[model samples]
Target chain A: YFQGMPTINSIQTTVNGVVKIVKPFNNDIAGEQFDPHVLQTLTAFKQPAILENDLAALRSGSLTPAIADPVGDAVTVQSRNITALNRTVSVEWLTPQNVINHTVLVYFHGGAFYGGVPGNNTVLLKLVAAKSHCEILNVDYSLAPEAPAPAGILDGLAIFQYLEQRDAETMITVAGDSAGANVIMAATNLNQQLGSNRINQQLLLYPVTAPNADHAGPLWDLAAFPIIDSQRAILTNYHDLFRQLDSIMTDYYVPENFDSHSPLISPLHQENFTMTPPTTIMVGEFDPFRPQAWAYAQRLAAADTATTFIQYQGLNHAFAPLVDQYWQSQDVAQVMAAALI
Target chain B: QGMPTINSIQTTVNGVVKIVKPFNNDIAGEQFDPHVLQTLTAFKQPAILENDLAALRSGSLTPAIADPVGDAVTVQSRNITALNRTVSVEWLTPQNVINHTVLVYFHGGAFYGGVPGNNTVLLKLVAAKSHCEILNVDYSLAPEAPAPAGILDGLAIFQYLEQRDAETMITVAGDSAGANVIMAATNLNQQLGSNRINQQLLLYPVTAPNADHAGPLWDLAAFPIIDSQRAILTNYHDLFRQLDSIMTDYYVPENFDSHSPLISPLHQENFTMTPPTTIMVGEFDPFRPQAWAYAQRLAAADTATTFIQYQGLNHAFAPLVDQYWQSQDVAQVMAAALI
Candidate 1:
């Protein structure tokens, strides 16, 4: 309750389900768990019928991303376009009340690099601003199939350069989840390949390293877990849709003659990691992309770059920030805060 | 490129002889190097690897020091107090040795197998190429000296080297079990923060010791060791996986935790302070997937890493550099990293 600070709503709800943990459980290879909040929200969003309705809403028209009240009021926010390298990316600024650290954390959202908006994560960004005492620059970059593979990476790099050129002394850390994290890695390495070295660190949340490469998914098989094995069809959207990438995804993103090892596309396939910054990579136990993220951590450590890897037991991909009611979501803010110092 | 005069592979798709077009470009993808094919053809004669198995069990193998050297470098045998034993280290000093840079070497032969003098030739070449002093480690082997023991011995020597000359840049390089021990030692060194390794060079390393390594990872279609017409256990590559498991038995004693980061560096959760690393593997080796897997883990940690897959090569190719063409390229990379 600081002066002039707006109240942000807590997402905890007891509408359905109950915890049955008689004894504290860890990564029970024989079992699994999820935040009731995340499961319900994702379950609602993943239904094929719900997606049809979403597109119908898109045709009917909609506006704003829910930041006008609690989120925007609590922070000094602005929507602006940043132009650099002949590319312009729309960005939203969320600066916390009563802090002028000049620390900026550039953020990108999850959506497989195709579907996402700044409003999608403004709720979590507000928390990150206060916890880390850093300004949040929410990036609304071009999505795939519209701009194609390197566009997001280019936009990210363009925005990074804009920031670096504007404030030479400001400490900048690029942060994101999934494909957002993917572009940060792509652009960060692009910076190394060309020139902007001002980015101080990286915070990757269940990043996609190689989009279509043959990589072992999770540590355990979906069939090995208790309820997930049978309930998996509806348990997570990742299993049915993302476990194996469809041609619709990669065909639109990657161009012909793409090396498949391009730094702009495959950060894991990139030949060098010498100039990458200190990084904190977190992944859920059941993320289909978990193994690749693990390898990314290994590569960074292999390169002698400083990195922290947090494997959250009994969770799914992007749970750190998306599952707001869960403690692991707070774990994201605190971990990012710790890394900021 | 498919002209018979150049090189087109003769194989079968479904129980019939099929002439395959020449398509091997990068080290990855559907083919083996010609030399790799030749070497595997050599191993197909049961008289070789089986005899090697017996030689391994007998414990009659020797260290790298006994491996004869030529005028390429000067070799000196030295001993230091390491983990309650006098550990011997063979020094290879090239003519134009870098003042503050040194490369340490560990020879691998399934842990139980001796250092086999042939690898000394490899070290001398790396030393001459990298223009740095080389230290070939002489420690206890498995079936006698076992896992964790080599790690302790490695740490001891590194400590002794660092304490004696704190300013020198040290790079650690090894193959197979040698890669395993040094990799674990360097990982622990990062945790302790007492000593620093400038770089780590792993040649077809053993990154995961405990993994049963089944499924699509071991199920290959064009791998030379498991896919070649003269391949061992054709259509069944799990034998190579078992060979790795058996190698663990020789190095790791009963009841030891194989998943301990010391035993399997791939299991290490924290990598914020690891040194720059280069992981090279043979595209045809059983450990290829895990090596590439470990490379991703290191990259995710934000550590600077370079991963290379040598086309048409197999496991423990370092000692056989005189024959394998990829060995010279490896020396060049090792030399460049040391510099």
Candidate 2:
């Protein structure tokens, strides 16, 4: 406790001899305190590295692992490839038995336009299908850096078309998280423009509706917290992806030549929300996207659409993915099921 | 097919004749529509204007009002003089009702304009639907009475009802400023060691209102509506005659303690036995932040509280009553809470 500063132990090896020395930060007493769970999550999550020299390798290695084979379960899982817009794409189906026959949830998984696949959300997909009592069609859309921005949207459209052709009697609802949610929203708008009212309801889980990193809210300022760290001016895009988001937003998501306010990219900036379907947005209390989600809910409501915003307290961003921490994801799953009902 | 103006609503209610004439003359030779200039007209509360105030005092505001009750329910109104104060009260009772739950209602007007007149449409529906008796208290307003005078009158009438029947379950309910008073009276009664209030139903209440009342919702600069923060701030300034009017000039005396537990119940330190509360706030209302703060405080103190927030609506959506579907939804919520 020298001059109100703690001492730390240090070992130094010189050319002539080895000596032990005291250092201030050895016990890390001078460091800021972090939530224990946050520390654990940070330790658990191994962020993938980006090799600047080999961008192709970076893109190729981002493929998510395959899902495990299912035994006896409440829901049956199957995978198939379909010719979407003349390009064959993979899709997984999770069907719960004895469920209502006319409703289908077409889901898109979250990746920052570059990572993730259907296998990444297999658990949540099964839970949603079982609880909501509906058939889940997980779209394995194309990712960016290999396919760029509009490729995923095109793939999503093709999947919608394929599903429409397969089951014309079923009511289709689009659901997704993060950048995947962004694709669903953009694709839904394009569907609306095409004079089709096929998509009924939208369930956005912690969606990135707009590109406003500087949103004003209480949760955005809470840093060093659990599950999600630094909800400040910057977003917890995971794996230091936010550091590269500035370029991703321009090159991959929005494209520098395009208008950022395009309803396809930023649905919140849309002049007319009348064509949108009934929407439900669920967000964690400590999530930076909460403010935008709340704003979107308000806009939908103002347009006389049925909208509900459910905020889970003491949770972090991507709480849906970390269902193991708290069974709160199951609670939200019930709400999602209820929306269909 | 023509553009909508103030004249569009003139033929509906003669009670609006005075307001319509003034507005038409004020904006003469100008073309506008309610939807186009919604924000411009949003902040104008009919009850707060001088002519509206005069109409209220002359008893013209108290029209032959009735709730939309079924043939089985009874709706009645009467004047009661009790606890050294004379106030008008409306009663709605459903026939063959077994429950003794009675909801005591207070209307909102920033303590200046509103009464049981405008709120009658909503309250009677609640009484009919919930199968409960609703007693609407028409308390005195300010700047005629000023501050704690109206507050004491509210407390006095509650005491009167308390003295009348102790076995009956009494729930205090209010909207906007009235909700503020209901909260104050409940806390006051609790502090005085007489806990007769069983529950509270607050709808978009002005629990922590101030001069800067625009709140979290953005202002509608293009519209002339009275619900915006500018409208609230302007009305507050006009009533209190200053920017720093906290407890002075309204609700309480100038010399009295402003932060007393009785005046602001949200500032209560320990809410052990406070009545189980149901608070409904609109997402776009300025009073929402305070409502959330109060709810957080109540939850922290281990109080039984149910907080429901409606999205897309503005402050005081309940007053819209049967006009909007959202209002009907709120009516259902209120009925459920009462039941």
Candidate 3:
């Protein structure tokens, strides 16, 4: 609505000719020529291995009369002292029933595989349990950088095994989003084949199905960001953690190490995978993991596994976790709860 | 090159099985046995009294088989002169090489217009993939015909095909309302222990007659909206005349029932009985909601049905027929199933 650019077309034309042409980005090379690769390098370098000591200490007798008071007594909240593979675990007992429901859920919070915890997933647990009336056990798995590579996978499996021993019900599901989702699938596939444990369902949230596949995302290239630096062309774990993942299954790692055909690490890769439980994978068209999710669904179908793929258009990564907005992360969480119920 | 083997099947007569023969190198390599077709042809049109006499005299026909519920609506015409009523068994080979595939396409047109010609591509695709002749059943449309009439054609086609035991691993595919008729027919066939289709592929199918699933449509809106207002049920029943209650008697499943795991093949109540399915829905199209609902139900029922919602596309997306998502994606998914 400016002079000589009253209409959208004219304005766009003027802007493209004047401002756009004058700028540096007319092509990929031009865009990347002076890119902020340094910032990315620093950020990647800033990522440290998960410090279990710090996370475990968060639950130490530090109840300094906060804004909220502890609620129910029947359901006990045990803090700290829950550590698996250098990752801290927090347990919450929700139901009062003696003969607890056999159905237990191990939830992993979404933080693009770098952050988040069990306590953070309380909202999801409460909603899903209320709706589906099932028991849930959230896992606080290890993250990247500090505990890079498949540390999350190790912690997730350990916690799952621990929970399985506690309950008699064989039916169990592993749930998460983004990085957490990746960890759940990894853990589920790993445990199902290795430790004699089976997952009943997988509730994924915009999970990064393939770190190196076509990607075909609308928002960002997750593989190029915090996970790996496009500038240095190196993973956050340039040596140990990343290479350790290569040891598990070279195909499970992002960018350089992942392959499209291995189901051990990339759970969707198993060709004759009949052991899959019912699954619901939700992705946003604008999320970086859209293509991966879609391809995973197709893989599951090919394997005759019960799988549902839901893509929310125009939603971006981490947008679903926004607790305040109408199109908040809670919308998807509610949908997931309904589906699980 | 070799002696004829009794292990193989060869031909069909008047849509019935007739002979069993070895692979005809002269024709193509296919499994086709047609002993029943030849047997039925021997006994020509047996009218009520004549049929009764023949049934009593020969003692071959059963009382139920001889005594039909209504006047036989069989069209006694030698009018197949145009394309040769011989039902030329031609293979429909397309881009993707397929095996064990058959397309039972019911022609579209709101069940009131268009003949069965639209099934040519479907026939080509199925025949190409399945290496078998497409059983493109030309059905009577409504106004001139009606609701159950379309369903009748579906039933008749299925019954006729089952008698022949042809079209194995069949893919009941159709566009628009034709898709609905095909689904209904397929479901009924399974329930009745008739030959079941290996897969169901619905293209922009009309699942609801009354409700505006999602929003206003373009291709289907041209026809009158079918809802509680119109005597569509009666008209549908009238089309079949006395056979209305019998044929369309069951709950019209294309509505919300399409969302039931027990109803729509896509929903796959018995995921074991239901074969792999592919549902293609267009984003801007009004049929979007029903297609989504159907796909969701299928997922919930634990069926591994592939659902593709084409973006920036409208109905009749296959009309474009390009090697892209709108058309190629559907073709690709089908390739995995039967091709």
Candidate 4:
């Protein structure tokens, strides 16, 4: 059966102490078969370094906002700056005209913990708000280096607490993607510790659980040629912060170097999974952190905690924002709306 | 990170010999990750697997009829006589039926149990998303109908579809044991020199038989799921004896060769040309190895194939009735493959 396919000997050759790369004879079908639309979009990304400039402009408030225009007589959007955890927090409220429920989804946008803004997830938040017929609070936490780790996490916890204390009857769900997911987990665990039963549900999307240095082999398997490389993103954008905190082992999020095994920091290490609200964890098939996400789901299932795990096939990490109009994220938003309502 | 989580130690002596059991030195904080723990549970539960087959053999368990969700799709059931045998088929069509693809799906029940009705929820979602008309075949089961019966019935239905529409695109799909039948039928079509099958979508397919004698890949006794090494081995063993008893009453072979390409399509060597195929296998499934092997063979033969392996899942993990994220994912995959 082994016929026209190329072998190791056929696809490689040494050139001046380095192996020259050669394409597979059937390279068209060799890689992961992504969605045609996703493949078309990925083809447009040649060098991701250009994003560094975009991020810098975003930090300087030079780029246009990513807010969605109000739908025809269906939805209304508003933005405001609020004080939380002794810092200014950017918050956006999206409310449909026909409000059917009292649940509020507090969303945290993902940008490797540094680049993402509230506008980045305008489509997702607007859809959930409209479909679920509930208001959405997009919590724009501070980015890294200028305001790193606990700053954003504390802001999320503060806003959740702020809402809970104001309206004790409102159903609230804390949800986020990537870095934002980590913040949600930490904040939820903190609420549990404080004996506060405020958050109703926890939704995480391809979250960053453990630090990159914690794992071996380039943080991810580069052999797969993934769309998003965790190590590459960190070095290219957050290099100075990484180098300054090199002395601390678990300094990715926490500055005091808290024990990495602490459940508050890494929910995967949480032994007592009970009392956590109904949770849902979603990860991409090609995501580097899928193993940990699976392990986390198993932990919840073993503890008999209400949790659902969905790993999307043939897609890379952070696909929701990358492929803005993707169906999986829309499915997730619909599911979240149903659960919260 | 390596803790005292070693559960079992297996050794081979001259192909099959000794097995040593070892306990953890530190049982205080020892637990296999969810997947490994599940595998271990399945490995220890051989009787549970046997019970599954026995339940099918009893014939007391009734198949649950799947209901339609809203007005998105319509479900219909009818019986058609093909090859002098009555075959029941379930049809699901989208509301906006315009230029729809036809999918012939086979339900998985290990060639003995299971009904096509259990898959109504999943098929409906696929039909709506892909805008495809689905025909789920409820072929004959064993004990009432034995080995090669289901395979022949599946081929008959394919031929029926071929005769009904010569130009329309028809895709063949099946899961678990149903996948095995589709593979066999595909090979039968090749032998008959008819390119009736446009494409094949195999989901966690049973491409090989003789579970106990299969390769090291099927030894996922540590993963937790519906199908495991011990469960598969028990089913195969029970099937053999049941086949023998049926042969006494009917006419069948005493020493059946399982390595035949008809039973195990992975044994097929000449794969220069075959129908375009899409195969999806769960990472934790024991059948994962066979799927990979078959995909490699198809690729080597220069056949168009798209292979997707889902990690953190087990055999028969995606049931349309569940309506969970995994099931939604399977529906999307089906839609993507067909459309």
The TM-score of predicted model 2 comes to 0.40
- After the best TM-score superposition of candidate 2, give how far the Cα of residue A218 lies from its true spot, in angstroms: 12
Interface RMSD of 1: 31.1
lDDT of 3 at B34: 23
- Give the alpha-carbon lDDT of every model: 0.65, 0.60, 0.46, 0.60
Better of 1 and 3 by lDDT: 1
> Which CAPRI category fits model 2?
incorrect
DockQ scores for all the models shown? 0.00, 0.00, 0.00, 0.01
Q: What would the per-residue lDDT of candidate 1 be over residues B58-149, giving only the tens digit for each residue?
A: 53343332111244367888888845767788888876667878887787777777553547766765775566888899766887788778
lDDT of candidate 4 over B112-145, digit per residue (tens)? 6678866776787677667678888888776467
- Number of the candidate with higher TM-score, 2 or 3: 2
Clash count for each candidate, listed in order shown: 33, 19, 29, 7
How does chain B of model 1 score on TM-score? Answer: 0.82
**How far does residue A129 in candidate 3 sit from its true spot (Å)?**
2.8
Task: Return the top candidate by lDDT.
Answer: 1
- Tens-place lDDT digits, model 4, residues A63-164: 112222224246677788767566678797788767865577888876555544565666676767777788888887766645656677778778877777
Residues B67-161, model 2: lDDT tens digits = 22323345678766666787778776764454657888888766665767667767755765576778887777766776566677677777777
Model 1 spans with C-alpha error above 4 angstroms:
A1-341, B1-29, B42-54, B57-69, B215-217, B221-239
Which lDDT tens digits does candidate 2 get at residues A1-341? 00222233433322112111212122433222322333334432244434242222223223222222222288888888888688677888888877887788988887666655566667677777776789888888877655666777888788778777787787888999877888888888887787767789998887877753442333243342233334322224332343344235435555555655577777777888888898877765555566666777777877777776665554445656443333455555656777776
